[PDB]
Amino acid sequence: TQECDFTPMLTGTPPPIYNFKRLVFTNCNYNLTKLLSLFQVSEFSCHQVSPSSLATGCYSSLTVDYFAYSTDMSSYLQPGSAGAIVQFNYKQDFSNPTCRVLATVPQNLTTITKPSNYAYLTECYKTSAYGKNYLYNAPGAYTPCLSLASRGFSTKYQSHSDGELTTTGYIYPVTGNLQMAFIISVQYGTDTNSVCPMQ
Amino acid sequence: QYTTEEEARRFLVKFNHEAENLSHESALASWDYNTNITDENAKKMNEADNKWSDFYKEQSKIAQGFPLQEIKDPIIKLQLQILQQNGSSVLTAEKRKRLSTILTTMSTIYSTGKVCNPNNPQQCFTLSGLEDIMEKSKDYHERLWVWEGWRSEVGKQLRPLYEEYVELKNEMARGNNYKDYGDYWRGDYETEGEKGYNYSRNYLMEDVDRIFLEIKPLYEQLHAYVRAKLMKAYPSHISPTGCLPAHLLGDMWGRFWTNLYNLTVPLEKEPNIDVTDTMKKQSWDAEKIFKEAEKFYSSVGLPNMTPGFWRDSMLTEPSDGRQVVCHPTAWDLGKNDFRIKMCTKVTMDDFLTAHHEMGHIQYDMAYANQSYLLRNGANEGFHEAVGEVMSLSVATPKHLKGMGLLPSDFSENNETEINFLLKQALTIVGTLPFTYMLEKWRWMVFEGKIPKEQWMEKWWEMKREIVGVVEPLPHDETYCDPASLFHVANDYSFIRYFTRTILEFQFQEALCRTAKHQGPLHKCDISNSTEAGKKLNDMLKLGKSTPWTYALEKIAETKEMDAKPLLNYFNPLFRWLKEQNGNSVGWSVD
Ligand SMILES: *[C@@H]1O[C@H](CO)[C@@H](O[C@@H]2O[C@H](CO)[C@@H](O)[C@H](O)[C@H]2NC(C)=O)[C@H](O)[C@H]1NC(C)=O
Ligand SMILES: *[C@@H]1O[C@H](CO)[C@@H](O[C@@H]2O[C@H](CO)[C@@H](O)[C@H](O)[C@H]2NC(C)=O)[C@H](O)[C@H]1NC(C)=O
Ligand SMILES: *[C@@H]1O[C@H](CO)[C@@H](O[C@@H]2O[C@H](CO)[C@@H](O)[C@H](O)[C@H]2NC(C)=O)[C@H](O)[C@H]1NC(C)=O
Ligand SMILES: *[C@@H]1O[C@H](CO)[C@@H](O[C@@H]2O[C@H](CO)[C@@H](O)[C@H](O)[C@H]2NC(C)=O)[C@H](O)[C@H]1NC(C)=O
Ligand SMILES: *[C@@H]1O[C@H](CO)[C@@H](O[C@@H]2O[C@H](CO)[C@@H](O)[C@H](O)[C@H]2NC(C)=O)[C@H](O)[C@H]1NC(C)=O
Ligand SMILES: *[C@@H]1O[C@H](CO)[C@@H](O[C@@H]2O[C@H](CO)[C@@H](O)[C@H](O)[C@H]2NC(C)=O)[C@H](O)[C@H]1NC(C)=O
Ligand SMILES: *[C@@H]1O[C@H](CO)[C@@H](O)[C@H](O)[C@H]1NC(C)=O
Ligand SMILES: *[C@@H]1O[C@H](CO)[C@@H](O)[C@H](O)[C@H]1NC(C)=O
Ligand SMILES: *[C@@H]1O[C@H](CO)[C@@H](O)[C@H](O)[C@H]1NC(C)=O
């Protein structure tokens, strides 16, 4: 029907992977080849769908999660790989069709603002007298250490605590252009599929 | 209010909250020095270690307000036993100053050692020159000068220092409710628990005596073979049924027999397996070696490395002007920070020291959710045994052929298996009577069963009854020949090299029968089997929170150490040596 706006995805600074931003769409008209031509797509790993069928079907809803993420560490977002990524930062949900795009945001796209460092969390737990009680993530949900991690990390392995909860960050600087990551999940409605391609 | 155990829980939570944040600073300040040696980086290391020591001493002073007989939980009791632990702070200030002066005077005397010839004295080698003279010399009169000169220019001075070090350490050990310093050293293997899982300090001596009397026949056959080859090497000097002279066994102390491999070789017409040329023709570098090691560890079910392992580790020697230390270590800095410092060169010997050094990181990644005090191996020998049980699986031709290094048409005849088992035995079984004899002599010295007039009458009697090694020159009661070893002058325990060779073939014989092996044990390969990784990780995850007999039951299904899996490894060699030697086995004590 109406045009969906990608200027939420095309302004400001893309946040780190633990504090990812969601872009739930409902009842509009998309053209994903307009979106994916602004970037340099280096990976299009999909699950239970093809990249051809992602831009042709009508859905009831459309969701996009985007964050700043270097393409070096592209072998940690892969489904099944218990690592300081899928345990503490972002675990992809697989009871739905999804695709994972990794971009290489160019110099001409000046509307994106480059951050200072990339960042992720190396542990998020709760202390005891017997050890550490790790708090693993949930599929598609935020980490429980998000209210602690939103104070800012300044050095590698700089912890933050309030009561029993503890987190630990890790930062490293940005070289070259910016690289992002787009997790594009769809959902099939039973009766009304009003998110159709733009014709 | 609360009872004593809840006060203990609150104190341990307050310790664990502040220890993690302060230990990583002291570890990162040392990592920034060991990979970049300047004078600006050797000051921050000392400041961070002083902050850590001033935290630890105050918490240990606080921790003595809890009587140990009121705790009912095992883990809180285990964490308060480590914390109370008075240590060397039981002497007076004068005794403490004198002990700290003796312990560095002995290391200073050992480290600066200089020996010149009784010939033309223009050559005066250091320690690293005399270690290289005795390693590759086939002369009876060179090694005799080097042996006698090192034991008369270093061990002659350490005797009036060792005679006071023994007494001061015994006075330090009779302040913490022990008997001698030997009891303080054998309290490393003491646990407590339910029926069957306990272990005392007075049982370790009986256990190592039982294991050595079980292991002695294979050593007698190996000693007879090495003596029959050395009789061909040096004529008219070695008796056909006597002991071996002390200055002919490979190196200065006779610890490893590895350098006798060019003398005591089997049927020599068999060039060995050297995949260095095939690795250089395929253009392998350090990153490819560590990626292949991570593929091997992921093949059995253990997790992958952190992303802060490929960005902070020093996997190659630098070229931007830094000065480094090139001894390979594996680091465990703190809050999920695992780094490896290693000067990797493209060879076959640095392909095994990557699978060894990543065997410590995979252990430190497994007990990482324990407390601060309980993040160690279950013993002092558990940590270097699990790293050596997985370097046995990658040097086999079952593994080097499936990786593409060896060609597919390789000939594994029995004359290549004997030539490999002998080179394994000359480093593994040739060093167990030496280790057991040295630790038994030190225990008898610290106990008081050897008075100071018999420190050399009992050293060379034990070295003839146990090791089977005679002296070339009569050493009277003014030398100190044990004190001319590195671990004796620098105050280290030596039984951790005996209780590590046993729990390595005990691990391998249990991991190979759960990976469904069919054949001899020396051709096994635990790759591509996720059933062996589960039995490994059920031991690795415990840390130090359980008694080590329970953690040994988790793999080997037996709560005692035994030398029956060691004699199952070397069984083709033990069948071949009995055919080669005949009935010349044994020695006469002369
Ligand atoms: C979707 O967006 C693209 C933006 O690039 C629109 O533009 C066309 O894209 C194709 C694909 O490369 C080109 O061959 C055309 O020349 C582009 N046309 C113009 C005017 O630039 C495309 O039209 C959009 N899709 C629909 C169905 O309108
Ligand atoms: C530390 O991690 C280990 C491994 O996850 C935990 O130990 C096991 O936890 C499971 C819970 O799913 C239990 O069913 C097992 O019985 C536990 N095994 C042992 C040997 O304890 C352990 O709980 C973690 N530490 C803390 C304090 O939770
Ligand atoms: C090795 O250590 C030296 C210490 O002298 C480091 O030199 C310092 O580096 C920091 C940040 O790079 C500067 O702020 C200091 O001014 C430097 N000090 C001096 C005296 O030059 C050096 O950077 C270290 N090497 C590496 C690769 O980090
Ligand atoms: C560690 O040493 C301290 C002394 O520094 C011991 O504390 C003493 O304990 C006795 C109880 O038998 C008290 O009568 C003393 O007053 C204590 N002295 C001080 C200075 O507090 C402590 O018992 C020792 N602990 C162990 C395990 O040896
Ligand atoms: C574990 O503890 C038990 C104590 O319950 C030890 O058993 C005793 O061993 C001594 C040996 O000097 C005997 O004199 C006692 O009669 C034994 N007690 C009982 C009740 O049988 C046992 O030796 C310990 N195990 C280890 C390996 O140290
Ligand atoms: C472990 O198992 C894997 C898979 O079963 C082996 O990998 C294959 O090895 C064959 C060699 O005959 C190659 O042709 C294949 O291309 C390999 N597949 C992959 C996905 O790499 C591996 O060689 C086995 N390793 C050992 C030591 O047995
Ligand atoms: C920006 O785009 C124009 C054409 O669209 C191209 O000519 C120019 O080189 C681009 N700038 C950069 C920095 O790549
Ligand atoms: C043993 O022989 C090899 C090859 O013949 C040689 O490189 C090595 O130096 C020899 N070592 C000793 C101790 O003789
Ligand atoms: C072991 O090697 C010898 C070579 O001396 C050979 O004669 C013998 O047949 C081999 N053993 C077996 C079981 O083939």
Degrees, nearest 5: CA angle B490-B492-B497? 135
CB B198 within 8 A of CB B114: no
Smallest Cα distance from B391 to chain A, Å = 25
Among the listed residues B38, B494, B432, B367, the one whose alpha carbon sits nearest the alpha carbon of residue A130: B367
C-beta B203 within 6 A of ligand 5: yes
The DSSP output letter for B464 is: I
The answer as to whether B78 is a domain residue is yes
Q: Which resolution in angstroms does this entry have?
A: 2.8
Q: Which residues contact B374 (CB under 8 A, 6 or more apart)?
A: A131, B75, B78, B79, B367, B543, B544, B545
Token match 């100053």: residue? B97
Long-range residue pairs from B35-41, CB within 8 A, at least 24 positions apart, any chain: B35/B314, B35/B322, B35/B324, B35/B325, B35/B341, B36/B322, B36/B323, B36/B324, B37/B322, B37/B323, B37/B324, B37/B325
Q: Provide the pairing of β-strand A165-173 with A61-68.
A: unpaired
CB A101 within 8 A of CB A43: yes
- The CA distances from residue B12 to B6, B188, B276, B332, in Å, are 10, 23, 52, 22
CB B249 within 8 A of CB B468: no
Q: Mutation test of ligand 2: which of A126, A132, A136, A164 has the most ligand atoms closer than 8 Å to its C-beta?
A: A132
CB B209 within 8 A of CB B561: no
What tokens appear for B345 in the block? 């060169």
Instruction: For residue B77, give its domain range.
Output: 4-85
C-beta A131 within 6 A of ligand 2: yes
Smallest Cα distance from A163 to chain B, Å = 10
- The CA distances from residue B173 to A151, B159, B177, B183, B269, in Å, are 50, 21, 7, 8, 56
- The CA distances from residue A66 to A14, A90, B326, in Å, are 7, 11, 43
The DSSP output letter for B319 is: -
Using a CB–CB cutoff of 8 Å, tell me whether B307 touches chain A. yes
Give the separation between CA B278 and CA B407, rounded to whole angstroms: 10
Interface test with A, best of B7, B309, B369, B370 (most A CBs within 10 A): B369
Smallest Cα distance from A128 to chain B, Å = 6
Give the separation between CA B466 and CA B437, rounded to whole angstroms: 7
Q: Whose CA is nearest to atom 1 of ligand 3?
A: B36
CB contact (8 A) between residue A159 and residue B13: no
What tokens appear for A175 in the block? 């070289």
What tokens appear for A8 in the block? 């939420």
Chain B residues with CB inside 8 Å of A85's CB? Answer: 307
What are the backbone dihedrals phi and psi of residue B116, each rounded to the nearest 5 degrees, phi first? -110, 165
CB contact (8 A) between residue B369 and residue A131: yes
Q: Which residues contact B147 (CB under 8 A, 6 or more apart)?
A: B134, B246, B247, B252, B472
Give the separation between CA B562 and CA A188, rounded to whole angstroms: 63
C-beta B262 within 6 A of ligand 9: no
Give the separation between CA B521 and CA B569, rounded to whole angstroms: 6
CB A91 within 8 A of CB A140: yes
What is the Cα Rg of chain A in Å? 18
Beta bridge partner(s), residue A183 = A65, A100
CB count, 10 Å around CB of B429? Answer: 23
CB contact (8 A) between residue B303 and residue A132: no
Using a CB–CB cutoff of 8 Å, tell me whether B82 touches chain A. no
Give the separation between CA A68 and CA A158, rounded to whole angstroms: 20
The DSSP output letter for A165 is: E
CB contact (8 A) between residue B20 and residue A131: no
Parse chain A into domains and list their residue ranges. 21-197
Interface test with A, best of B32, B335, B336, B362 (most A CBs within 10 A): B335
Which DSSP string corresponds to A34-97? HHTTSS---EEEEESS-TTGGGT--BSEEEEEEEE--GGGTTSSSSS--STTTTTT-B---SS-
**For residue B318, how far is the Cα from the chain centroid?**
29
Going from the Cα of A75 to the center of ligand 6, the distance in angstroms, rounded, reads: 20
CB contact (8 A) between residue A172 and residue B311: yes
Query: For A73, which of B17, B24, B307 is closest by C-beta distance?
Result: B307
Which residues of chain A approach chain B closer than 8 Å at the C-beta? 73, 76, 81-85, 120, 122-123, 125, 127-134, 156-157, 159, 161, 168, 170, 172
CB B350 within 8 A of CB B520: no
Among the listed residues B411, B396, B416, the one whose alpha carbon sits nearest the alpha carbon of residue B522: B396
Note the CATH number of domain A21-197.
3.30.70.1840
CB B526 within 8 A of CB B511: yes
Among the listed residues B59, B34, B56, B54, the one whose alpha carbon sits nearest the alpha carbon of residue B45: B34
CB B145 within 8 A of CB B121: no
Give the separation between CA B148 and CA B355, rounded to whole angstroms: 40
Chain B residue whose CA is closest to A121: B336
Ligand 8 atom, smallest distance to B250 CA: 13
Among the listed residues B100, B98, B129, B92, the one whose alpha carbon sits nearest the alpha carbon of residue B114: B129
Experimental technique of record: cryo-EM
CB B150 within 8 A of CB B131: no
What tokens appear for A178 in the block? 């910016």
**For residue B453, how far is the Cα from the chain centroid?**
31
Going from the Cα of B237 to the center of ligand 5, the distance in angstroms, rounded, reads: 50
Give the separation between CA B561 and CA B549, rounded to whole angstroms: 9
The DSSP output letter for B302 is: P
Among the listed residues B476, B294, B473, the one whose alpha carbon sits nearest the alpha carbon of residue B390: B294
- The CA distances from residue B467 to B53, B460, B464, B569, B588, in Å, are 43, 10, 6, 22, 12
What are the backbone dihedrals phi and psi of residue B124, each rounded to the nearest 5 degrees, phi first? -135, 95
CB B426 within 8 A of CB B258: yes
Q: Which of B69, B85, B101 is the last residue of a domain?
A: B85
C-beta A108 within 6 A of ligand 7: yes
Residue B225 annotated as binding? no
What are the backbone dihedrals phi and psi of residue B334, each rounded to the nearest 5 degrees, phi first? 155, -125
Chain A residue whose CA is closest to B13: A129
Give Dmax (Cα) for chain B.
84
Long-range residue pairs from B438-442, CB within 8 A, at least 24 positions apart, any chain: B438/B482, B438/B485, B438/B488, B438/B494, B439/B208, B439/B493, B439/B494, B439/B495, B439/B498, B440/B466, B441/B482, B442/B182, B442/B482, B442/B488, B442/B494
Give the separation between CA B570 and CA B521, rounded to whole angstroms: 9
Residue B123 CB-density burial (10 A; 0-12 exposed, 13-18 middle, 19+ buried): exposed
**For residue B225, how far is the Cα from the chain centroid?**
26
Among the listed residues A159, A124, A160, the one whose alpha carbon sits nearest the alpha carbon of residue A142: A124
**For residue B32, how far is the Cα from the chain centroid?**
26
Catalytic residue set of B: 357, 487
What tokens appear for B234 in the block? 């040096």
Chain B residue whose CA is closest to A83: B306
What tokens appear for B26 in the block? 């002291």
Give the separation between CA A46 and CA A48, rounded to whole angstroms: 7
Give the separation between CA B579 and CA B528, rounded to whole angstroms: 37
What tokens appear for B476 in the block? 């009277």
CB B186 within 8 A of CB B548: no
Query: For B304, which of A83, A157, A159 is closest by C-beta distance?
Result: A83
The answer as to whether B420 is a domain residue is no
The total number of residues shown for chain A amounts to 199
What are the backbone dihedrals phi and psi of residue B483, each rounded to the nearest 5 degrees, phi first? -75, -10
Q: Which residues contact B247 (CB under 8 A, 6 or more apart)?
A: B134, B143, B144, B146, B147, B472
Going from the Cα of B401 to the center of ligand 9, the distance in angstroms, rounded, reads: 23
Give kind and range of the element (H or E) at residue B296.
helix B286-299
The DSSP output letter for A17 is: S
Smallest Cα distance from A49 to chain B, Å = 29
What tokens appear for A131 in the block? 């050890």
Give the separation between CA B480 and CA B162, rounded to whole angstroms: 9
Helices (H), B174-243: 181-186, 204-233
Give the separation between CA B39 and CA B354, rounded to whole angstroms: 30
What tokens appear for B99 in the block? 């002990």
Q: Which residues contact A198 (CB under 8 A, 6 or more apart)?
A: A3, A29, A30, A31
The DSSP output letter for A3 is: B
- The CA distances from residue B513 to B2, B78, B507, in Å, are 51, 34, 10
Q: Looking at the 3D structure of chain B, how many domains does it have?
A: 2
C-beta A133 within 6 A of ligand 2: yes
Chain breaks in chain B (C to N over 2.5 A) after: none
Token match 């992720």: residue? A120
Beta bridge partner(s), residue A195 = A59
Residue B130 CB-density burial (10 A; 0-12 exposed, 13-18 middle, 19+ buried): buried
Which DSSP string corresponds to B481-499? SGGGSHHHHTT---GGGTT
Using a CB–CB cutoff of 8 Å, tell me whether B76 touches chain A. yes
Give the separation between CA A123 and CA A159, rounded to whole angstroms: 9
Residue A52 CB-density burial (10 A; 0-12 exposed, 13-18 middle, 19+ buried): exposed
Helices (H), B365-431: 397-400, 414-428
Long-range residue pairs from B403-408, CB within 8 A, at least 24 positions apart, any chain: B403/B292, B404/B282, B405/B275, B405/B278, B405/B279, B406/B273, B406/B275, B406/B278
The answer as to whether B305 is a domain residue is yes
- The CA distances from residue A49 to A46, A53, A54, B31, B483, in Å, are 6, 7, 7, 48, 73
CB B8 within 8 A of CB B76: yes
Beta bridge partner(s), residue B330 = B340
Query: For B13, which of A73, A125, A129 is closest by C-beta distance?
Result: A129
- In chain B the first and final C-alpha atoms are separated, in Å, by 73
Ligand 2 atom, smallest distance to A131 CA: 27
- The CA distances from residue A190 to A60, A174, B49, in Å, are 8, 45, 65
Token match 């300044």: residue? A154
Give the separation between CA A93 and CA A65, rounded to whole angstroms: 12
In B109-197, beta strands by DSSP E: 115-116, 124-125
B412 alpha carbon, closest ligand: 9
Smallest Cα distance from B27 to chain A, Å = 12
